Design a protein around this ligand. Structure first.
Ligand SMILES: [Mg+2]
Ligand SMILES: [Zn+2]
Ligand SMILES: [Zn+2]
Ligand SMILES: [Zn+2]
Lengths: 765, 228, 146, 183, 67, 151, 43, 150, 110
């Protein structure tokens, strides 16, 4: 039969899922961690030095997980099922190369293990990578098992995907009877802080930093950041609009109210308010302290004497404030999906390992100082017995953080709980749904229902029915079926490309013409302005479709806020979409014929420019068709399959569009509690609790989802002969009538297996 | 009208969200009958009838000139032209900074003069210009807004979104005999503890009558009696 | 429904090209909202009335609703004729995207389909936008209860 | 349907651009008067521009306040650091040909109140420090590189630019397909 | 796990038809419907007992611990 | 604009150009060139781009022999291979119907106007000699030029 | 600040008053799932 | 390991949010039967349908019946799935009513039921909440040391 | 005011000098714009804030349904305004709130 694009474009979903499984956020994040972020930590903390014995150093040259240079193979890892059975941690050793100086001018390498790295299941370092169900049989592992969790002390722990507001981005919010505050939570690789920004009174605009004693008025900081003309201030923050001028003039007047200002007068004013630095470098208490204050006021770290970038950033901050004060509804929804980011297991473990490695290096330097403080016979030979003994701390911390879920990061200074949860083994669907589960940010003031409502902007990105009941109702969310999470890619080669494509740098731009053209933002920062914003957007999109820039960069244009926005950061949620050009789809069923024939795996639809990822923000600029039949020649994309708006669990529902939505939500709840088949190795497993159906049947009415997630291979239920009638009076209020002699013949017959573990502990005596 | 309303009533909180004062009138007409009372209860009217405000300087004299438009003051039914506007300006700019002599050159072009550690004159003139088109000339400065309502008849009652019940009760053209507010503590301080318990009972009953909650009124009576 | 959609889009084009008669109690932007919502509610009520009047004697939902044991004529009409209008926070579904509810509609479009009106019944099945709008409406009811 | 050639030149020329944000290009129909320049300064190793333009004395000077508040106010100082940007090429037309010269460190000049600085310091009178701290440390430690503003010599520069623009001629070979990836 | 001996609803023996149904599917291929009708499974309960069965025991035997 | 709050006209006090909120967008496009007055999201862009070609060609014609006018050109920072790059690079061509193009190398690009600079611009020469450091003035910029590669 | 003093014993939902004085756990009580029974008298 | 028979109070659900415990377990002969002697494993109240408005469950019953009669597993995908007209055509072709409503006889009286009964297979899941792990009863026993309460 | 100097572009202010001259001196820069019989006026428009008509009622635009109110003996109302909310757990059905068009009596039929 000839391929019909309308009803065969759905095969792009199985094509996408073959190479990008449902448990892929965790997988890719952990692979990225262990492959590049470990090198990044070891290259940040590359050398440790001592005050004494200057002719001596320790160098961290290389870092590796699970492999040595002695043999081509990796080390033997006790398989994850054996780790589960023996209540140990599925971990691979971290090997480093050490350059420690010998007293007789000798230079050597080494392969020294500094701890065990808890390895995520089915990652690159995991032994179950690319196994053919035969090695899985030999390893007593289920081929259908999701992977993407950790076995620490024999318990399956999953680092849930974390929801949080996007960092390094301006958010503006109003309020009633209090004023307008709008922050920019800026996070560096070593210091996180939020540059708060509120209107105290009289329409006066202030900058409120934690390190600053009192909120510095806005004209003062604007004059401090090089913009000291006090007309270009009003030009940058006000443009040519008449209302904003009088809205803003009060804090212009205040600038002269105190004393007329040069740049350095404002800089001294800022510096007078810096709190403290734990009484180190006391000789910096001068006008120069404001330089560090402004350097550590945001992410726009300045390493020179030009303050234009930070000045324009603060001017946009102010102008958004002024827009909000002129009229509300210029604020951003804090629950808009475009304003959130998803931290993943790899990023979490990256920061945790960075903290643990800093502790390890501090303690190693302490031990080295204690050893080498001795006057005589300072033999250098075998100076690594300490690190051989001292390797236990990295492993202990790395295991315990995952085991307990509490992550005590001294450097970044917060205590978070519930980062990990025990992977649920009630059902195969329960485990798979604990994967692809998102936990929202706490300290949210649960008394209100902003981040509890379902948003129209989560269409196709977060499942529209898989939201749990009772207390965390709307706080825990689930990923949709056909979704990707962007990864952090370098921003510097895209700024150059933007300059090539006609964007003129802000340092080339004057204040009086800034709000007359569209301004191009890179990750929320005004890098410049451009004529022809729509042409720039089209050329950028053409470059991305031709693969000249990463497919995950998002470009969209805001008309109310005259801006072309380009986003490159990781954590943005995106989904693939068929590109509709000139009123026609780009797939045209020859690509579909190739795809079912075997050629053109899903990646090639991206290399060919037929399919592109859209995040929530680009969906503002897009116009998607649900079906090929209603493609009007003004639409920009076409849905691959609209049933992907439901997650894995909600795909168990037959005909969900014929139900009231609460019924779909409740089935999303109960399907994870359904009793059935767990895994192909369920009788080899020994779990704290396990419910198994004796005679599980696959549903007679299934969906595409349940066969895309192999639910028909381990089903949880049975096809009961049902008569819908009133009977016996014992069926009122949800009560059921069960056939005796169906129960006799095995209908509904299940069993429970419970484990009891004891250890014959040896004692001191 | 829900859990927060019942909470407010039984907590006897002094500040409530949406305190509504229901005021019945004496006559039956819109033009020049009920709009007059509505104007008699209004928040602020300077900006409403200023039509501009000036920042005027000369060789040695400074004017804050405002040209009150008789057209707005006539179309919007209010009783004020110049003198009460001037005295209200004096009171408000005294509460802000100072006001000793507010002059009227005539023809609705009332001008305010400022005279006196430097540039303070210009700063105070600017702040007076900013705080000028916000002052109250007509109406009680307790009512955020008034709104004429219809009780499915030809009777145009008005209920005000304010915190002053005695003023609305004593306002001309409002029948004080039938004029109740939904603020129990406002009823208590103006009418008495018996009227306070009546207001409590009526407010609670009405609150649960808008949710279909069929409670015998004796329970509400006992609640009011134990509260008062 | 086609007659109702026609009046709705006529009011849409009037509001867009010019200025409608703003209601006394509410400003311009929501007077179109009130007019469109009233018209859609009227068409839903009339279609449901026709469905109920054509319902069969010995219809099980009709009997349960008539005797009051379970359900109602609203539930029957939503199952059979039309799930009328998804109302969240007291009005139609607001813009989830920039000046727009879903990217599957034109920008600054206020057609009944774009702002929550579910033409379908639960018998015929909900089209993907209508399904999402219904989900938000149900979530709105479930929210606040906690 | 014509062709206009552009030619690169000025390989060694240090051609800076001044961006006087303090004054408009043209107040009226005609271009604004180019202000007189005197006592211009540049700080190497810092790329700091200081340019002095005297104030008019016949009108709007406030001489009494000027001398009573600050000792030297006759000149007006516009200060702005040159910012190194690439791809900015300065052009002119001579013989139906546009001659390009690369621009080094455009600067944005804003008024500078050094007399207010000195009055404030005279009032107040009675450790790697790297990073932005090191930038200002360098600026106020290694400084005082006086420049001599010699205005008027355009013809030498223009005939020179033509000299490197006609003697040298180079052809291009890079594939268009390769250029797109080179972007 | 393994095909139930009897249909849950009727009690008709269907555990002696699993292998015959599999052989009808593989050797001399038939449709599932006609293969169920060939075995004598007339009632839809006996039909679903075989049509919806998932033979998980063959997958569990891949982990036999006493080889 | 809207209502403006009313020896040398350039020494008179300067007030910002103020436009009402109800019409900020319309006057915005008018004053983008009117503030200089030098001596639909696709069609509008293309027509204003064609106007940019007509203005750019007008300026090149009036810059043919003036000994003071300069333009700043925005070229890509990585030009096609042929900085130590000297000589003739290519041509700026005038196509039919008023549109222009630039052939920097073997490639063909388009040429636009970029942002307008409503303030004084002047070019100078830096020659810091060990004998004598001197700064030399050359001319004044009349407009920015942006050339963009096209795929 | 997890240190549990005397006033911590008395304050709270699970404190002393609201947890043991007014409301406590009782003997001779049971709890299980409820099922319907029409042949049971309403009392 | 502990085998568990489904008993009174065990919770079951049917993929449409329609959960509920076993109210009664009745003998097969007391159950209603059709012409072929097919007898239901589960009887579920019609009163659960009108208010919950789970038309998807009815369509699932009909599609499952047509699927078992046709020898093929059906599809109930969101915004798609097997059309109801096709399933009704399969049902009519095999001798059943198009609407999945068969005439049953009473198991206890033997007479025809005066209403046609929605009859067919529905996927039912047994939920982890069993009454054996919830039944708890205390008369006297362990007491808190500090408060001397149960 | 909102005016700025031509030299340093800082915001201009009014200062009282000798003979009480209200000159527009620019702080931080020797600039002096005196007043010689010249009027500096800054006019900004203010809104008219027209009248607002009676609030009345727009109950014609509210979804009705065919339900007889509990107070049928007093008022024979066959219609009732409604709106449905799910104020139960997601396993109970939705709740419908009513309001009789003949008396205004509200009730919830669940
Ligand atoms: Mg319940
Ligand atoms: Zn059977
Ligand atoms: Zn000045
Ligand atoms: Zn009634």
């Amino acid at each position: 039969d000839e391929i019909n694009t309308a009803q065969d474009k759905w095969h792009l979903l199985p094509a996408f899922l073959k190479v990008k499984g449902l448990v892929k956020q965790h997988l890719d994040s952990f692979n990225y961690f262990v492959d590049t972020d470990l090198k990044k930590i070891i290259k940040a903390n590359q050398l440790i030095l001592s005050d004494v014995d200057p002719e001596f150093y320790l160098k961290y040259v290389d870092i590796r997980v699970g492999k040595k240079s002695s043999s081509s193979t990796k080390d033997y890892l006790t398989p994850p099922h054996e780790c589960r059975l023996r209540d140990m941690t599925y971990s691979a050793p971290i090997y480093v190369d050490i350059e420690y100086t010998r007293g007789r001018n000798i230079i050597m390498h080494k392969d020294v293990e500094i701890g065990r790295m808890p390895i995520m299941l089915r990652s690159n370092k995991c032994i179950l990578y690319d196994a053919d169900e035969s090695k899985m049989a030999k390893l007593n592992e289920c081929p259908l098992d999701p992977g993407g969790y950790f076995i620490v002390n024999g318990t399956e722990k999953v680092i849930l995907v974390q929801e949080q507001l996007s960092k390094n981005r301006i958010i503006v919010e109003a309020d009633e009877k209090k004023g307008i505050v709008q922050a920019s939570v800026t996070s560096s690789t070593h210091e996180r802080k939020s540059k708060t920004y509120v209107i105290t009174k009289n329409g006066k605009i202030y900058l409120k930093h934690n390190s600053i004693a009192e909120e510095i008025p806005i004209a003062i900081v604007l004059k401090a950041c090089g913009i000291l003309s006090d007309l270009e201030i009003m030009q940058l923050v006000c443009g040519n609009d008449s209302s904003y001028q009088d809205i803003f003039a009060v804090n212009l007047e205040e600038s002269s109210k105190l004393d007329i200002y040069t740049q350095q007068q404002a800089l001294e004013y800022i510096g007078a308010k810096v709190k403290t630095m734990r009484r180190q470098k006391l000789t910096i208490l001068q006008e120069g302290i404001e330089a560090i204050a402004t350097t550590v006021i945001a992410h726009l770290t300045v390493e020179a004497l030009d303050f234009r970038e930070k000045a324009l950033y603060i001017a946009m901050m102010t102008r958004r404030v002024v827009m909000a004060m002129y009229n509300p509804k210029m604020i951003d929804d804090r629950d808009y999906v475009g304003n959130k980011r998803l931290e993943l297991a790899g990023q979490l473990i990256s920061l945790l390992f960075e903290d643990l490695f800093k502790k390890f290096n501090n303690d190693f330097k302490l031990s080295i100082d204690k050893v080498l403080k001795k006057p005589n016979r300072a033999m250098e030979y075998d100076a690594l017995l300490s690190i051989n003994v001292h390797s236990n701390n990295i492993t202990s911390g790395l295991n315990r953080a995952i085991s307990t879920g509490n992550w005590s990061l001294k450097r970044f200074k917060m205590e978070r709980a519930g980062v990990t949860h025990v992977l649920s083994r009630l059902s195969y669907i329960s485990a798979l749904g604990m994967m692809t589960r998102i936990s929202s940010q706490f300290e949210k003031s649960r008394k209100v229902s902003g981040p509890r409502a379902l948003q129209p902007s989560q269409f196709g990105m977060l499942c529209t029915a898989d939201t749990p009941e009772g207390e965390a109702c709307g706080l825990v969310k689930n990923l949709a079926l056909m979704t990707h999470i962007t990864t952090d890619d370098e921003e510097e080669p895209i700024k150059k490309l933007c300059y090539v494509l006609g964007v003129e740098d802000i340092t080339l731009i004057d204040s009086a013409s800034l709000h007359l053209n569209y301004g191009v933002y890179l990750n929320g920062t005004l890098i410049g302005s451009i004529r022809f914003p729509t042409k720039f957007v089209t050329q950028f999109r053409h470059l991305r479709r031709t693969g000249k820039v990463s497919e995950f960069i998002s470009i969209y244009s805001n008309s109310h806020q005259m801006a072309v926005h380009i986003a490159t950061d990781g954590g943005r949620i995106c989904r693939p979409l068929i590109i509709v050009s000139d009123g026609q789809s780009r797939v045209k069923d020859i690509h579909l014929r190739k795809l079912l024939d075997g050629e053109l795996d899903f990646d090639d639809f991206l290399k060919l420019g037929l399919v592109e990822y859209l995040d929530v923000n680009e969906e503002n600029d897009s116009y998607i068709a649900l079906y090929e039949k209603d493609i009007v020649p003004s639409m920009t994309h076409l849905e691959i399959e609209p049933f992907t708006i439901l997650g894995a669990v909600a795909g168990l529902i037959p005909y969900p569009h014929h139900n009231q939505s609460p019924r779909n939500t409740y089935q999303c709840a109960m399907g994870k509690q359904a009793i059935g088949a767990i895994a192909y190795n369920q009788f080899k497993r020994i779990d704290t609790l396990l419910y198994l159906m004796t005679y599980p049947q696959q549903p007679m009415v299934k969906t595409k989802t349940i066969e895309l997630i192999d639910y028909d291979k381990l089903p949880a239920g049975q096809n009961a002969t049902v008569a819908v009638m009133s009977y016996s009076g014992y069926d009122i209020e949800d009560a059921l009538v069960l056939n005796k002699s169906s129960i006799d013949r095995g209908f509904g017959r299940c069993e429970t297996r419970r484990k009891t573990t004891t250890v014959l502990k040896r004692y001191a005596n | 009208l829900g859990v927060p309303r019942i909470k407010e009533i039984i907590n006897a909180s002094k500040v409530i969200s949406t305190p509504i004062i229901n005021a019945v009138l004496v006559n039956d007409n819109d033009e020049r009958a009920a709009r007059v009372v509505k104007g008699r209860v209004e928040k602020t009217l300077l900006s409403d009838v200023a039509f501009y405000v000036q920042d005027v300087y000369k060789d040695n004299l400074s004017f804050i000139q405002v040209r009150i438009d008789l057209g707005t003051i006539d179309k919007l039914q209010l009783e004020l032209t110049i003198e009460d506007i001037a005295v209200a300006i004096t009171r408000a700019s005294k509460l802000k900074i100072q006001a000793s002599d507010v002059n009227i050159i005539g023809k609705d072009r009332i001008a305010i003069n400022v005279f006196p550690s430097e540039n303070d004159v210009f700063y105070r003139m600017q702040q007076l210009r900013r705080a000028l088109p916000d002052v109250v000339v007509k109406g009680l400065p307790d009512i955020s807004r008034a709104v004429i309502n219809i009780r499915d008849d030809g009777k145009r009652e008005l209920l005000v979104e304010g915190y002053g019940l005695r003023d609305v009760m004593c306002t001309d053209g409002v029948i004080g005999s039938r004029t109740t507010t939904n603020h129990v503590l406002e009823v208590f301080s103006v009418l008495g503890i018996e009227a306070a318990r009546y207001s409590i009972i009526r407010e609670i009953n009405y609150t649960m009558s808008n949710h279909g909650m069929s409670v015998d009124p004796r329970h509400i009576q006992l609640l009011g009696d134990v509260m008062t | 429904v086609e007659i109702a959609y026609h009046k709705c889009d006529e009011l849409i084009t009037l509001f867009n090209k010019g200025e409608l008669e703003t209601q006394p109690g509410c400003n311009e932007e929501q007077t179109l909202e009130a007019k469109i919502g009233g018209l859609l509610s009227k068409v839903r009520e009339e279609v449901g009335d026709v469905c109920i009047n054509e319902l069969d004697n010995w219809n099980a939902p009709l009997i349960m609703a008539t005797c009051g044991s379970k359900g109602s004529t609203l539930n029957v009409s939503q199952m059979v004729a039309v799930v009328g209008q998804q109302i969240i926070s007291g009005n139609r579904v607001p813009d989830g995207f920039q000046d727009r509810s879903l990217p599957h509609f034109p920008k600054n479009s206020k057609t009944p389909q774009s702002k929550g009106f579910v033409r379908n019944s639960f018998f015929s099945g909900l089209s993907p936008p209508e399904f999402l709008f219904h989900a938000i409406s149900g979530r709105e009811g479930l929210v606040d209860t906690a | 349907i014509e062709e206009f050639p552009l030619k690169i030149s000025g390989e060694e020329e240090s051609l800076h651009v001044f961006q006087y944000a303090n004054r408009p290009r043209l107040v009226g129909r005609k271009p604004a008067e180019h202000p007189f320049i005197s006592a211009a300064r540049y700080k190497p190793k810092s790329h700091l521009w200081e340019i002095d333009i005297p104030l008019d004395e016949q009108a709007f000077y406030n001489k009494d306040k000027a001398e009573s508040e600050w000792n030297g106010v006759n000149v007006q100082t516009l200060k702005g650091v040159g910012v190194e940007n690439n791809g900015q090429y300065a052009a002119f037309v001579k013989d139906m040909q546009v001659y390009l010269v690369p621009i080094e460190r455009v600067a944005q000049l804003k008024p500078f109140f050094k007399y207010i600085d000195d009055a404030n310091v005279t009032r107040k009178q009675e450790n790697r420090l790297t990073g932005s701290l090191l930038a200002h440390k360098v600026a106020d430690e290694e400084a005082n590189i006086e420049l001599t503003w010699a205005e008027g010599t355009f013809e030498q520069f223009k005939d020179t630019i033509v000299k490197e623009a006609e003697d040298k001629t180079l052809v291009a070979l890079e594939k268009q397909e390769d250029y797109i990836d080179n972007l | 796990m393994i095909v139930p001996v009897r249909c849950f609803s009727c009690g008709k023996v269907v555990g002696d038809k699993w292998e015959s149904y599999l052989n009808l599917l593989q050797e001399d291929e038939l449709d599932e419907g006609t293969a169920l009708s060939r075995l004598g499974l007339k009632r839809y309960c006996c039909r679903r007992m075989i049509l919806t069965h998932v033979d998980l025991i063959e997958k569990f035997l891949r982990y036999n611990p006493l080889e | 604009x809207x209502x403006x709050x009313x020896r040398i006209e350039q020494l008179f006090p300067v007030r910002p150009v103020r436009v009402r909120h109800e019409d900020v967008e319309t006057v915005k496009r008018e004053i983008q060139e009117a503030l200089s007055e030098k001596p639909k999201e696709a069609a509008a862009e293309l027509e204003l781009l064609n106007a940019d070609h007509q203005h750019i060609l007008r300026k090149l014609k009036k810059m043919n022999n003036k000994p003071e006018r300069f333009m700043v050109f925005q070229l890509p920072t990585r030009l096609p291979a042929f900085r130590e790059l000297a000589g003739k690079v290519g041509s700026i061509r005038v196509h039919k119907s008023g549109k222009l193009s630039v052939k920097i190398g073997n490639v063909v690009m388009d040429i636009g106007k970029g942002a307008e600079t409503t303030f004084l611009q002047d070019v100078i020469a830096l020659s810091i000699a060990d004998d004598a450091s001197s700064a030399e003035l050359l001319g004044r910029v009349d407009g920015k030029i942006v050339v963009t590669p096209q795929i | 600040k997890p240190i549990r003093g005397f006033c911590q014993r008395l304050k709270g939902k699970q404190g002393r008053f609201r947890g043991n004085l007014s409301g406590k756990r009782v003997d001779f009580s049971g709890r299980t799932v409820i099922s319907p029974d029409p042949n049971l008298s309403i009392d | 390991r502990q085998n568990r028979r489904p008993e009174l109070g065990d919770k079951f659900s049917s993929r449409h949010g329609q959960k509920g415990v076993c109210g009664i377990i009745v003998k097969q002969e007391d159950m209603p039967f059709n012409d072929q002697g097919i007898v239901p494993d589960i009887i579920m109240n019609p009163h659960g349908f009108p208010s919950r408005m789970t038309v998807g469950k009815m369509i699932e019953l009909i599609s499952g019946k047509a699927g078992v009669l046709n020898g093929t597993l059906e599809y109930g995908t969101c915004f798609g799935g097997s059309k109801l007209e096709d399933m009704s055509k399969i049902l009519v072709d095999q001798g059943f009513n198009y609407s999945g409503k068969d005439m049953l006889y009473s198991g206890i009286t033997g007479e025809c039921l005066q209403a046609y009964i929605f009859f067919g297979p529905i996927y039912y899941q047994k939920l982890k909440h069993m009454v054996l792990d919830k039944m708890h009863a205390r008369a006297r026993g362990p007491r808190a040391v500090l408060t001397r309460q149960p | 005011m909102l005016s700025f100097c031509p030299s340093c572009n800082n915001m201009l202010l009014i200062t009282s000098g000798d003979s009480g001259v209200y000159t527009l001196a620019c702080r931080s820069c020797p600039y002096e714009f005196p007043i010689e019989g010249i009027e500096i006026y800054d006019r900004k428009k203010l809104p008219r804030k027209e009248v607002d008509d009676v609030l009345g009622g727009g109950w014609d635009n509210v979804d009705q349904t065919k339900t007889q109110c509990p107070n049928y003996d007093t008022c024979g109302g066959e219609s009732a305004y409604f709106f449905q909310l799910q104020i139960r757990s997601a396993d109970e059905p939705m709740t419908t709130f009513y309001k009789c068009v003949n008396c205004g009596h509200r009730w919830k039929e669940n």
